[PDB]
Amino acid sequence: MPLRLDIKRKLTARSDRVKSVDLHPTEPWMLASLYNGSVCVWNHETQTLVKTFEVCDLPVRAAKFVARKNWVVTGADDMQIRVFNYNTLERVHMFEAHSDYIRCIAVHPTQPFILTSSDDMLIKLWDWDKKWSCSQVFEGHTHYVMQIVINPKDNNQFASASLDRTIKVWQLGSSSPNFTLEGHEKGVNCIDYYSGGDKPYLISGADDRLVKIWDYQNKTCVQTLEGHAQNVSCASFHPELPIIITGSEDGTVRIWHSSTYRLESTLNYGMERVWCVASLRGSNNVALGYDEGSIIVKLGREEPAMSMDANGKIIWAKHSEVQQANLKAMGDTEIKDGERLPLAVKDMGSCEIYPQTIQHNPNGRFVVVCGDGEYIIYTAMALRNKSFGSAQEFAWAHDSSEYAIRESNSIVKIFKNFKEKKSFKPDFGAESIYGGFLLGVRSVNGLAFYDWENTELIRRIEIQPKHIFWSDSGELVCIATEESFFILKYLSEKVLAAQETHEGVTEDGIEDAFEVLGEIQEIVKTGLWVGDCFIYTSSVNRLNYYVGGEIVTIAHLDRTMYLLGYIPKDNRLYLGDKELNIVSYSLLVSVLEYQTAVMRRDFS
Amino acid sequence: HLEKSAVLQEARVFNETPINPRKCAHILTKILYLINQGEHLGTTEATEAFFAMTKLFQSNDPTLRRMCYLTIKEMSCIAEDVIIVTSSLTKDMTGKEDNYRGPAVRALCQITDSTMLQAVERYMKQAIVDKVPSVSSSALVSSLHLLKCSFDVVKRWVNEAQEAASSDNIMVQYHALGLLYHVRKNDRLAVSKMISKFTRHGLKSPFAYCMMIRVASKQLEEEDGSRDSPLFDFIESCLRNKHEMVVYEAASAIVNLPGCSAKELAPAVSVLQLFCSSPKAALRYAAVRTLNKVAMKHPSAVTACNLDLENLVTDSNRSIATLAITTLLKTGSESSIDRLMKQISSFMSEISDEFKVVVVQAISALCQKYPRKHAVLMNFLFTMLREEGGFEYKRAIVDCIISIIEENSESKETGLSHLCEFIEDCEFTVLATRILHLLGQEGPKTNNPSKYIRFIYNRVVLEHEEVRAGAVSALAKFGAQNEEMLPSILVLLKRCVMDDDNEVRDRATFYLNVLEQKQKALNAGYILNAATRQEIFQEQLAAVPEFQGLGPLFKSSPEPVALTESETEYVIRCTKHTFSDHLVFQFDCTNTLNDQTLENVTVQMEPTEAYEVLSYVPARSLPYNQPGTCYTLVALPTEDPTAVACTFSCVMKFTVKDCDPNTGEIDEEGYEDEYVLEDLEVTVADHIQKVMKVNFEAAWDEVGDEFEKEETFTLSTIKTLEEAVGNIVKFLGMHPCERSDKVPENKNTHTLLLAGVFRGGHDILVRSRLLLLDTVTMQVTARSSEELPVDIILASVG
Amino acid sequence: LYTVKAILILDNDGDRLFAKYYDDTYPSVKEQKAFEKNIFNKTHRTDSEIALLEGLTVVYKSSIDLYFYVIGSSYENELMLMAVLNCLFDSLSQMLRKNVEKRALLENMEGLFLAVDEIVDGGVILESDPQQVVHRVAL
């Protein structure tokens, strides 16, 4: 299945062998330790350095942020532990815990702890509240302690990896593991945990190119995986998607689906080997140290697929990667604007294709959903497949009765009820296609207007946008185009005549179609037509509607979000997160209308 | 032999540790044997057995692991506890004796329950999915019995679930699909996009192909769309490979030609036919009987002779014997050859693979293609039938006689003649019973009295009070009717023929006595044995009393409209009714989804071209797949320009309530959502009776007089009525006239001077003079006896 | 496909020393015998290349000592169906180094049994070739 997916080369740096990486969540800062011996902390967002520290100039193996603590923890292989309060980078304390090359720290978050593993064949626990006591020493070694990871899930219990090939999982009441298991046929480089609390897997790494999965509760190697191209420097659990990240001793990325387990893809930033990895716990952004540098990639959608019937059911599907099996919500009750609400429970669905679009039929009704690149349309109540095919790009014929498609070539065919509509068949350069009332083909950094029955270049305007929302009846239409935004009139009659006369301009489209009413310089988180009113979000998180020459913020939102739906009757807006708590604020549409009409001189 | 007893006692063997795998296994075997052969027993003992057995389980004694599986295996939809193992299942689960693990799960699943269902689940998910093909297989089978029970637990998992079904072993690949038999039972759409997956890849298991075929086929009947390329694609696919079954499979359905497909397909088929034509696929026989249908087309038929001749000739192979009868039959035969065959048959039929049965089937077909018809054949056959005989004809006779009756055969004189005679000296009392009964009814409608009498006497002639008796009973229908001579004599006869022998005496006496008892004529008798269609609807509607006017229905709907499109949850078909005063839309239906029952139902209509809107009515409750009625009512304004044709806007409102169909619940709560309601448009034919005039000449003019509106168009891009024509005959629903209707596939000029009467009593009249100069310019007149119609017609016609 | 009404290995004394009604919906040990009787008595060690009884496929065989019955529906092609039937003779023969006999039958049932479950399990033929089996099994 396709990479029609989010992969972003989020941030780059080319550097050295950056051994270690550690994440500051609480503010998405990242800490990295180098084979240089200098460590740096960056705000990636603008490729800006939050702080750098020369902790040692010997390669600095281990790093943590202690967020709770508000301090940042550092260690270099002067075998000393140096502390900074990250709240400057003011350096708090130093002392010598482990006297050999200190490989890893694992931390109890709940409980005030710093766990360390070091090459001394020792794991020591030190207590920060006790002011770096060596509270307890965990031993049962056979070699250098290469890695420690805390099962944070049960913080409390943790697992250890060594290249003598074995793994000890421990209980506090075992300053030794509970047991050791004889994992590798190589060495166990690494041990990692399974994001879910529900089930339990570890992945452990080797360069032997074999992966074993283990279920702790049973205590099995669930299974052992092969296929590989080169010594897997690392392989990781995708915590967002069910995929397997494989990494190599050459810095090869191979992905196997942690569901298909089919090689979904190979990527080369041959920046050489997977030294480190660290992942967003919000499960979406990840960074790995490579030799030639490091790269960070951004990998997410911002939504599920759902569309809401104005009775009041936003039927979404899935949750985040859960089966689609879950749609419904007519609710049953009422409560205060600020306060929160209850859902119903009765799934339908359990599709396979993984979507990223939902769009309702124009009457809510028929949704066409695309995923895996093909479109299943559902008969919804029916839970029937209304229909399917493979896309590239789309417009419903807004009317609620036809649809258009952009074939994964790029040349148009349109179908109304599986009949191609060729009365209209430009196939010009595009960019994207827009439907609605009036046909857009967005092409050649222009947006070009077309008929609905034959094509006509109605108009072309200056540039290309990103999105269109049309007023409801089409009329005044709203196009979202980065920061900036415009509101327009489309004037029919001219066309009728002009057309009759035939002789026109269409390079530009015909200058005798549309008019440019006014423009707001705008940034949109999400946006809305209330009729022709543009009620909109801004990504600056004020919910405003541009009204009357005025834009007013009804309210400003946490941070910005998704517009649940205003079921007008109720006159309220349901606001929607993506975490399935709905908030509602009533307006009263009439008020707007009242305003609309009166200005129009419909005072009465 | 079998018996429980030794074994229960013998359970103390469990007590030993020195045992040999063999020794015990056998003992275990003995119990299982009784059972394999069949046994029945108490639970208590079974339970006990379990315990006893269960008791043993230190080892991994492999052999030991299997037997129990059996044992357990014996119990699955009629079990005894589940829990006991549990541990043991898990033990496998962490435990790599891979082998074993798989059998155990499999048994459980007929035996299962929901809580316990909860158990396997994360793992399970894995497990189905897990590793070596072998293990995975083991997993699968297990569900199915649980599917009996249910399986939905599974089901759910599905968007996500299927994808793993992606395969890399043939055997496996085949298997995946059946589960998909039920999967596709659940869904059709899914297939379609799916197929393009199935379609997308060439397949492994001949086996996999097969299910698809049925399916594929299944799809085809009404058409599987533009099977052209697929069908074709398939066509190769079925057509050749190294696995025969597919080609054949395809072949039998696919013909297509009564003046239809025969192209490639006949040759390919031929390659096959011939190829098969000696028991390659002894399959070939069945097909001709129907699967690959035959009743031919005329030159085509002649070609068929050779193949049938091979079978006909060969006479062997059960598969052959059957084949002979179907092929010959389907293709049909000349008289002549039959002759040769009759002799062949003479030997053959008795046993020649046990020909008689195929033959009786064949025979049943014979009776049908000629069930007393080609009577010459029927007789030739008859002679032959009796003759070749054995005895086995009798069975056949049951059919044959039946066939003759089905025709209600008319060369009876002859047919009967053979029957009568032969049967006499072809015996079997039993036949006589049946035939008697039939004959019993028939009598003098088919005459030939003397003969028939002649017969009848004979039939009686035979002894048996009983044999004798039938001639009298048959006679009652007959007697009563009398024939070409009978009543006088009919009276004379019962007298002439008379009998003693007590109860036989009695029969004569009694029939007589019975006869004695009623006036024989009577005796025989006892013993022997506007305000339209639509008005009705006005009345049908009438049982309700929430009215706000009605009238009497004038005309009804020219077309009922499904107000919810195809096969929707709230499937609606609507019918509209016109009365002289009101129009009612009464709404016909099947609140579709078993999801729902709709409650608090009423129907909104909102209008454009007049009607006074009195009310929206809805049905109180609508459960699934069951008409209920909802109505919407209007009163019809008649003398206005623009006032009864209307489109009304519909929105369905209901409080939507969920169902349990098993046993439900009906409670005050549940919440509304409203769904769009389809338009209703009202016609100029729901209201009208189309007519011929009370006075056309006069009326024709007259209607002009008071009434007349006009529209003219001059037609310059098309010089054809026809477009116009499509809108006018059809929209108005009236009669085109003044002998001014008719046009062939062309015609120079046309007038419809056209009729019917509108609701509210008064008439709506139209003259359309279509004029062809060679452009068309035309005068459409509407003239009316009602004001609202002249404006209307001109519109409405469109 | 949950398609075995029963597979029986019958003696040709109308006896049945094996029956598994993989699938069943009619009963009685008697009726089973009766049903058996009509057909068995009739086929009487004789079999047919093909036989259909009940619109249903009857594939049955005979050995040199034993009568094999499978009942299925003529609603699923011979070639495959037989293939399983074939599989049944052959593997038993090779593996054991001996095919069925009355004698063989008499000494031990189990192996048949062992095999049978493996091959088929109910109305779904999980498998129809020996080899897999042959390795798979090792008893």
CB C50 within 8 A of CB B323: no
User: Look-up: residue for tokens 């897999």?
Assistant: C132
Nearest to B163, CA basis, from A515, A321, A13, A138: A321
Residues C104, C98: Cα–Cα separation, whole Å: 8
DSSP-derived secondary structure letter, B14: G
Tokens of B396: 């056949």
Token pair in block for residue C40 = 């068995």
Out of C29, C124, C136, the one facing B141 most closely (by C-beta) is C124
Task: Write the CB contacts of A421 (distance below 8 Å, at least 6 apart in sequence).
Answer: A402, A404, A414, A415
Q: Do C17 and B285 touch (CB under 8 A)?
A: no
d(CA A534, CA A544): 8
C1 in contact with B, Cβ within 8 Å: yes
Instruction: Give the closest of B122, B193, B671 to A388, CB-based.
Output: B193
Cβ of B181 within 8 Å of Cβ of C79? The answer is: no
- Name the resolution in angstroms: 17.0
Cβ B763 vs Cβ B789: under 8 Å: yes
CA–CA dist A243, A264 (Å, integer): 9
Q: Minimal CA–CA distance to A473: which of A449, A489, A452?
A: A489
Taking the CA of residue B461 as centre, how many other CA atoms within 13 Å lie in the half-sphere pointing to its CB? 8
Identify the helix (H) or strand (E) that includes residue A383: none
Identify whether the C-beta of residue A334 lies closer than 8 Å to the C-beta of residue A341: no
- A 380-439 near B (Cβ less than 8 A): 381-382, 384-389
DSSP states along B275-328: HHTTTTTTTHHHIIIIIT-----HHHHHHTHHHHHHHHHH--SHHHHHHHHHHH
Residue type at B612 in one-letter notation: E
The token pair that represents A148 in the structure block? 């420690």
> If residue B250 lies in a helix (H) or strand (E), which one and from where to where?
helix B245-254
Q: Using what technique was this structure determined?
A: cryo-EM
Asked if A6 and A300 touch (Cβ cutoff 8 Å), the reply is yes
Q: Quick one: residue A548, left, alpha or beta (phi over 0 = left, psi -120 to 50 = alpha)?
A: left
Contact state of B160 with A331 under an 8 Å Cβ cutoff: no
Strand A364-371 relative to strand A355-361, pairing = antiparallel
Half-sphere exposure at residue B371, Cβ-oriented, CA atoms within 13 angstroms: 18
* The CA-based dihedral angle spanning residues B632, B634, B636, B641, taken in that order and rounded to the nearest 10 degrees: -100
Looking from the CA of C125 toward its CB, the CA atoms found within 13 Å total 24
Would you say A191 and A143 are in contact if contact means Cβ atoms under 8 Å apart?
Answer: no
Q: B148: nearest CA in chain C?
A: C2
The C-alpha atoms of residue B121 and residue B153 are separated, in whole angstroms, by 10
Q: Check CB contact under 8 Å for C126 and B175.
A: yes
Largest CA distance in chain A: 93
C contacts of B78 (beta carbons < 8 Å): none
How many interface pairs between A and B have CB atoms less than 8 angstroms apart? Answer: 96
Residue A353, amino acid = I
Task: Give the Cα-Cα-Cα angle B292, B295, B296 (nearest 5 degrees).
Answer: 95
Q: Tokens representing B548?
A: 């706000």
C-alpha span between B52 and B348 (Å, rounded)? 62
Place of tokens 């409608």: B445
CA–CA separation, B281 and B279 (whole Å): 5
Distance CA B23, CA B26 (A): 6
CA distance linking residue A569 with residue A566, whole number of Å: 8
8 Å CB contact between A94 and A78 = no
The answer to whether B157 contacts A260, with C-beta atoms less than 8 Å apart, is no
For residue A331, the chain B residues in CB contact (below 8 A) are 671
Would you say the C-alpha torsion B697, B702, B707, B713 has a positive or negative sign? positive
For residue B126 the two structure tokens come to 């894995």
In Å, the largest CA–CA distance within chain C is 40
DSSP E strands, A15-61: 18-23, 30-34, 39-43, 48-53
Query: Two tokens at B210?
Result: 């097969």
Q: Which chains touch B (3 or more CB pairs under 8 A)?
A: A, C
Q: Given CB atoms, is B706 within the 8 Å cutoff of chain A?
A: no
> What is the CB neighbour count within 10 angstroms for residue B532?
17
Q: Which of B94, B159, B675 sits opposite A323 (nearest CB)?
A: B159
Gap between the Cα atoms of A115 and A149, Å rounded: 9
Nearest to B319 among C50, C108, C126 (CB): C50
Which stretches does DSSP call E strand in B55-121? none
Given an 8 Å threshold on Cβ–Cβ distance, is B286 in contact with C52? yes
* Cβ neighbours of A586 (radius 10 Å): 12
- Three-state SS at A142: coil
In this structure, what token pair is assigned to residue A74?
A: 């550092």
What is the tally of helices (H) and strands (E) in chain B?
Answer: 36, 15
C-alpha span between A534 and A486 (Å, rounded): 11
Q: A352, B158: Cβ pair inside 8 Å?
A: yes
Beta strands in A128-260, from DSSP E residues, in sequence order: 133-138, 147-150, 158-161, 166-170, 179-182, 191-193, 202-204, 211-215, 220-225, 235-237, 243-246, 253-257
Cβ contacts from B onto C, under 8 A: 74
Residue owning tokens 């027993």: B41
> Tokens 């169906």, residue?
C81
Residue-wise burial string across A496-507, b where 16 or more C-beta atoms lie within 10 A, e elsewhere = eebeeeeebebe
Q: What is the largest CA-CA distance in chain B?
A: 121
Residues of C in contact with B29 (CB under 8 A): 108-110
List C-alpha distances in Å: A65 to A31, A50, A160, A601, B203.
8, 13, 21, 63, 55
Q: What angle do CA C22, C24, C29 make, to 5 degrees?
A: 100
**Alpha-carbon C116 to chain mean position:** 9
- Assign A206 to helix, strand or coil: coil
Residues in chain C: 139
Residues of chain B numbered 358-397 and touching chain A (CB < 8 Å): none
Q: What is the dihedral of CA B700, B704, B706, B711, to 10 degrees?
A: 140
The residues with which B634 forms a beta bridge, in sequence order, are B583, B613
Tell me if residue A40 falls in helix, strand or coil. strand
Q: In whole angstroms, what is the distance from residue C69 CA to residue C130 CA?
A: 19
End-to-end CA gap in chain B? 89
**Which residues pair with residue B578 across a beta bridge?**
B555, B583
Which chains form contacts with chain A, at 3 or more CB pairs under 8 Å?
A: B
Beta carbons of A15 and A294 less than 8 angstroms apart: yes
Question: Which three-class secondary structure state does DSSP give residue A514?
Answer: strand
Instruction: Return d(Cα C66, Cα C88) in angstroms, integer.
Output: 12
Residue B136 phi, psi (nearest 5): -60, -40
Query: What is residue B500's three-state secondary structure?
Result: coil
* Chain A residues with beta carbon closer than 8 angstroms to that of B158: 323, 325, 349-352
Q: Report long-range pairs for A367-374 (Cβ below 8 Å, ≥24 apart).
A: A367/A307, A368/A394, A368/A396, A368/A403, A369/A305, A369/A317, A370/A394, A371/A305, A372/A1, A372/A2, A373/A1, A373/A2, A373/A4, A373/A408, A374/B193
Amino acid at C136: R
Give yes or no for a contact between B793 and B764, defined as CB atoms under 8 angstroms apart: yes
SS3 B615: strand
Return d(Cα A331, Cα A321) in angstroms, integer: 24
Helix/strand/coil for A81: strand
**C139 to chain B: closest CA residue:** B63
- How far is it, in rounded angstroms, from Cα B366 to Cα B368? 5
A367/A387 Cα distance (integer angstroms): 10
Per-residue DSSP letter, B566 = T
Q: How far is residue B731's CA from residue B723's CA, in Å, rounded to a whole number?
A: 12
Per DSSP, what are the bridge partners of residue A192? A203
Nearest-angstrom CA–CA distance, B714 and B771 = 10
Rounded to the nearest angstrom, the gap between the alpha carbon of residue A369 and the centroid of all alpha carbons in its chain is 19
**A343 to chain B, closest Cα gap in Å:** 13
Which structure tokens are listed for A340? 């929160």
Closest C-alpha to B209, from B163, B159, B164, B244: B244
Q: How many CB atoms lie within 10 A of CB C57?
A: 24
- 3 state DSSP class of A226: coil
Within 8 A of C126 by CB-CB distance, chain B residues are 137, 141, 175
Burial of C59 (0-12, 13-18, 19+ CB in 10 A): buried
Which residue of chain A has the CA closest to B568?
A382
Rounded Cα distance between B475 and B441, Å, is 8
CB-CB: which of B155, B159, B161 is closest to A353? B159
Contact A413, A431 (CB under 8 A): no
Q: C63-80 as b/e, with b when 16 or more CB fall inside 10 Å?
A: beebbbbbbbbbebbbbb
Q: 3-state secondary structure string, B761-798?
A: CCCEEEEEEEEECCCEEEEEEEEECCHHHHHHHHHHHC
From B37, B181, B244, residue closest to C79, measured CB to CB: B244
Element (H, E) at A583: strand A582-586
**Hey, what are A415's tokens?**
């179908």
- B344 phi and psi, to 5 degrees? -65, -45
CA dihedral B102, B106, B107, B110 (to 10 degrees): 170
- Give A297-364 as a 3 state SS string: EECCCCCCEEEEECCCEEEEECCCCCCCCCCCCCCCCCCCCCCCCCCCCCCCCCCCCCEEEEEEECCE
Tell me whether residue B430 is exposed, middle or buried, using C-beta atoms within 10 angstroms of its C-beta: 0 to 12, 13 to 18, 19 or more.
exposed
Give the mutation candidate from B132, B238, B245, B323 for the C interface (greatest C CB count, under 10 A).
Answer: B245
Q: Can you name the residues that pair with A471 across neighbouring β-strands?
A: A474
> How many Å apart are CA A86 and CA A71, to the nearest integer?
5
Whole-angstrom distance, CA of residue A374 vs CA of residue A1: 11
Q: Are B740 and B749 in contact (CB under 8 A)?
A: no
d(CA B634, CA B583): 5
B24: enclosing H helix or E strand = helix B21-37
Name chain C contacts of B37, Cβ cutoff 8 Å: 16-17
CA distances from A135 to A97, A98, A120, B128, B188 (A): 11, 13, 17, 46, 65
Residues contacting B692, CB < 8 A, separation 6+: B735, B737, B755
Contacts of C52 in chain B (CB under 8 A): 286
Token pair recorded at residue A374: 């093909």
- The H or E element spanning position A562 is strand A562-567
DSSP string, B577-603: EEESSEEEEEEEEEE--SSEEEEEEEE
* Strand-strand pairing, C67-71 and A562-567: unpaired
Which residues of chain A neighbour B656 with C-beta distances below 8 Å? 330
Closest by alpha carbon to A530, among A500, A557, A514, A554?
A: A554
CB of B44 closer than 8 Å to CB of B113: no
- CA distances (Å), B720 to each of B710, B739, B772, in order? 20, 20, 9
Residues 6+ apart with CB under 8 A from A492: none
A581 touches chain B (CB under 8 A): no
Other C-beta atoms closer than 10 Å to the C-beta of B22 total 10
Name the β-bridge partners of A441. A433, A448
Separation between Cα atoms, residue B634 and residue B629, nearest integer Å? 16
For residues A554 and A570, give the distance between their C-alpha atoms in angstroms, rounded to a whole number: 17
8 A C-beta contact, residue B703 and residue B783: yes
- Radius of gyration in angstroms for the set of CA atoms belonging to chain A, rounded to a whole number: 29
What three-state secondary structure class fits A450? strand
Residues B321, C87: Cα–Cα separation, whole Å: 27
Q: Where are the alpha helices (DSSP H) in B644-721?
A: 696-706
Residue in chain C lying closest to B39 (CA): C29
| B570 alpha-carbon distance from chain centroid | 25
Strands A104-108 and A460-461: unpaired
- Which burial class, exposed, middle or buried, applies to B487 when counting CB atoms under 10 A from its CB (0-12, 13-18, 19+)? middle
- Which residues of chain A have a CB within 8 Å of the CB of B595? 381
Quick one: CA dihedral A91, A96, A98, A102, positive or negative? positive
Chain A hits for B93, CB-CB cut-off 8 Å, are 218, 220
| Phi, psi (deg, nearest 5) at residue B440 | -50, -45
Rounded to an integer, what distance in angstroms lies between the CA atom of residue A165 and that of residue A162?
5
Question: Is the Cβ–Cβ distance between B634 and B582 less than 8 Å?
Answer: yes
Exposure letters B683-708 (e unless 16+ CB within 10 A, then b) = bbbbbbbbeebeebeebbeebeeebe
Put simply, the answer to whether B245 touches C29 (Cβ < 8 Å) is no
Least CB-CB distance to C77: which of B37, B144, B283? B283
Backbone angles phi, psi at A579, to 5 degrees: -125, 10
Best probe of the B interface among A388, A401, A417, A419, by most B CBs < 10 A, is: A388
Which of A259, A311, A323 has its CB closest to that of B674?
A: A311
* CB-CB neighbours of A340 under 10 Å: 10
3-state helix, strand, coil in chain A (%, to 5): 5, 45, 50
